Amino acid sequence: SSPHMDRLLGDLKLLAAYDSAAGWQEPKAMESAFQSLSWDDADVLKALPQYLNCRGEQKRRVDFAYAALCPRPVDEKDPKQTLMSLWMKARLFSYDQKHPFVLSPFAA
């Protein structure tokens, strides 16, 4: 009944778990985290190629939100990290194109 919210919070928890398991040297845990990351979402899958070709204001909004949630730059060589980043960005892109973000504190 709240799938978008639920899947968002789950994705964030799984990212945190991946980072912790990497720090603690735990391939089993971090692969479990990678596998449990909501890859079966049709909306995000449809929005992925749209994000990959978007440009301008929408892209800047989504980049701002992604840098808020995950400002660390992932290693350009690690495809698992790259893919989870892409997935999170596609999710945010879907949410933004349904209901755009309002990031300023000044608003009415």
Binding site: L48, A67, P73, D78, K80, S85, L86
Partner: protein
Amino acid sequence: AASTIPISQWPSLLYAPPSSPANPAVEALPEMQFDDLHYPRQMLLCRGAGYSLEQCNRMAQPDARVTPENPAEKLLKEEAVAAIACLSQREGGKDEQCRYYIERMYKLANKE
């Protein structure tokens, strides 16, 4: 083996962290940025120019001075899309079902 890092060595630990299975881009760690003053500064400048609050909020735009984008998202586009298709079909790559695409990506990025 992994010995304690005293408090005096933490500034070097922040920009030269130890090795992990999931490392960041150490060369780009000085380039990660996120301005908490972006919108306040924008509003201050526009209100000093002479605009109203509504005009400022309509003219406001989000910061471009954030952490740069991964170049892999533009270079390895098709490979990443195929990997994500494989994952969506095969339940996150359980028991080594997206190893093909992941290994192709790894080779392309690393080159021995």
